[PDB]
Design a binder for this molecule. Structure first.
Ligand code: HEC
Ligand code: HEC
Ligand code: HEC
Ligand code: HEC
Length: 107
């Protein structure tokens, strides 16, 4: 159980970096994102060696970095997956939280 970093955290493993703010996700349990690995919630960087370290856009295994941030039907809600539920039928929120362009993730 480490300490939540300050906002402005830059996820920049790709050419479309995204800023993650812990403050806006205060209502979400730490473990929902820093999920269990070998029985214990893991707080290492998502793309740590052995984790989601493959940058291949088509890798849908546990090694797929982009898969972990965008896809639905995953064991743990991904960024987009959780945002889809949050936005519901609200088209404005869907654009803001799940859009591939013109969203708060990818301008
Ligand atoms: C998802 C909705 C998250 C919630 C809720 C919490 N965190 Fe988080 N955190 C998240 C991401 C996407 C990242 C970036 C990881 C990366 O690959 O760089 C982080 C990062 C951290 C870190 C720093 C990791 C490092 O660089 O070593 C820590 C220590 C951390 N987060 C802690 C933390 C705690 C204690 C939370 C709840 C109280 C918590 N986070 C929630 C995503 C999410
Ligand atoms: C290695 C130590 C990892 C770290 C750090 C993170 N994850 Fe992970 N993830 C890892 C494994 C081995 C697994 C599967 C665990 C299982 O019980 O099956 C996963 C899985 C996910 C998933 C779901 C994948 C799917 O069902 O297709 C997501 C969405 C996911 N992980 C996201 C995620 C994020 C955003 C992380 C950083 C905040 C993160 N994980 C760290 C291994 C490791
Ligand atoms: C739920 C389980 C979530 C996961 C996983 C992630 N996010 Fe999220 N996020 C969530 C909520 C409930 C909200 C607020 C909704 C609203 O209408 O404001 C958000 C908001 C954001 C935002 C906008 C606010 C901001 O910090 O700029 C962004 C850009 C954002 N979230 C990004 C993000 C990323 C990159 C995630 C995975 C790495 C991610 N979120 C996961 C709920 C949840
Ligand atoms: C936040 C909730 C996001 C939304 C909405 C979408 N994406 Fe995303 N994307 C997100 C993260 C956390 C990252 C990684 C940031 C980093 O640099 O580490 C990404 C990355 C991508 C990339 C990589 C670009 C490249 O270099 O090839 C692609 C291709 C991408 N994202 C596509 C994409 C699509 C198709 C989306 C709509 C369905 C979309 N993203 C939304 C977070 C978020």
């Amino acid at each position: 159980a480490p300490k939540a970093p300050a906002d402005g955290l830059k996820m920049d493993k790709t050419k479309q970096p995204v800023v993650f703010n812990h403050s806006t996700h205060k209502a979400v349990k730490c473990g929902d994102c820093h999920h269990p690995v070998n029985g214990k919630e893991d707080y290492q960087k998502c793309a740590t060696a052995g984790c989601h370290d493959n940058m291949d856009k088509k890798d849908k295994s546990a090694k797929g970095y982009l898969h972990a941030m965008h896809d639905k039907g995953t064991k743990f809600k991904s960024c987009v997956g959780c945002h889809l539920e949050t936005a519901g039928a609200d088209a404005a929120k869907k654009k803001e939280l799940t859009g591939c362009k013109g969203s708060k993730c990818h301008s």
